[PDB]
Design a protein around this ligand. Sequence first.
Ligand SMILES: CCCNc1ncnc2c1ncn2[C@@H]1O[C@H](/C=C/CNC(=O)c2cc(-c3ccc(F)cc3)cc(O)c2O)[C@@H](O)[C@H]1O
Ligand SMILES: [Cl-]
Ligand SMILES: [Mg+2]
Length: 213
Amino acid sequence: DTKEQRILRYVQQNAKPGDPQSVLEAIDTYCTQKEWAMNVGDAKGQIMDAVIREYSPSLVLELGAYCGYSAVRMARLLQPGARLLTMEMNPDYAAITQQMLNFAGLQDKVTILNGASQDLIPQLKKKYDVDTLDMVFLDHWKDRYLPDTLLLEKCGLLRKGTVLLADNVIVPGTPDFLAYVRGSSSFECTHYSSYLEYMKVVDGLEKAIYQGP
Ligand SMILES: CCCNc1ncnc2c1ncn2[C@@H]1O[C@H](/C=C/CNC(=O)c2cc(-c3ccc(F)cc3)cc(O)c2O)[C@@H](O)[C@H]1O
Ligand SMILES: [Cl-]
Ligand SMILES: [Mg+2]
């Protein structure tokens, strides 16, 4: 048995089927009264919600699905016809994310891509029929935010106005990523101070809007 399986089971037993909000609530409740887990969480999730609503992205890429909390959170706010692609290298977690999304009734808005971002990103145009991304949410291994951002650029997947939203830029921290988007003329950046999921440790998200090269 694993922590991720317990979280799924808790949602399946307590949340309301086909109700994405009840899924988020049940995951938060589990993590608030039982085992901590690395979901973006409710505080940072409010900022995520705000960004999704403001920019109304038709195509979103998520790096790092984990239990699918962020996938549920973004997907539930997407406009009809809009789509989310989520990359997850761990097949156990990909399987959990799929069951979470199924439960939430969001399976038709989300496609889970299995594998590591550095290998999937270069297949997006040919294999998954992507032109450009409107939004990217980064929440995978922290030392990979910068390399994956450069890879997305190199592959021609960013357009002017593409919104990158990055979790955990303070804790655990993505100092290299921040130095890059804040120093580069190719991004205009806005920092959102909040709190780490399920506690009062200060963390934040960085919003970095691609300007073109
Ligand atoms: C080298 C491969 C990089 N490419 C990748 N491609 C696809 N999926 C990837 C992935 N890397 C990681 N993943 C997956 O993303 C998820 C990993 C996320 C890493 N997250 C964290 O480390 C993290 C950690 C904390 C944390 C904060 C404070 C603390 F004391 C302890 C932990 C808080 C967070 O909000 C976090 O997001 C997993 O599901 C993993 O399988
Ligand atoms: Cl929270
Ligand atoms: Mg995170």
